[PDB]
Amino acid sequence: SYQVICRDEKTQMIYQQHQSWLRPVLRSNRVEYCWCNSGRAQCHSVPVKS
């Protein structure tokens, strides 16, 4: 009921506030890092050279 979740349509999974959840890469080998900063899903791309 309250606003504290984050709906990600790129995976179809909900997340809580300040919650972190990774996502597939773009086309190379990077990783999509994203976490709820308030309810808009804050994302940032930081590679990992796997």
Listed by start position, the domains of the chain span 1-50
CA distances from 3 to 12, 42, 43 (A): 18, 16, 19
β-pair partners for 35: 20, 42
Is the distance from CB of 6 to CB of 22 less than 8 angstroms? Answer: no
CA distance 30 to 13: 21
Measured in degrees and rounded to the nearest 5, phi and psi for residue 15 equal -140, 155
The two beta strands, 13-15 and 32-35, are unpaired
Q: Could you tell me the fold of the domain covering 1-50?
A: Complement Module; domain 1 (2.10.70)
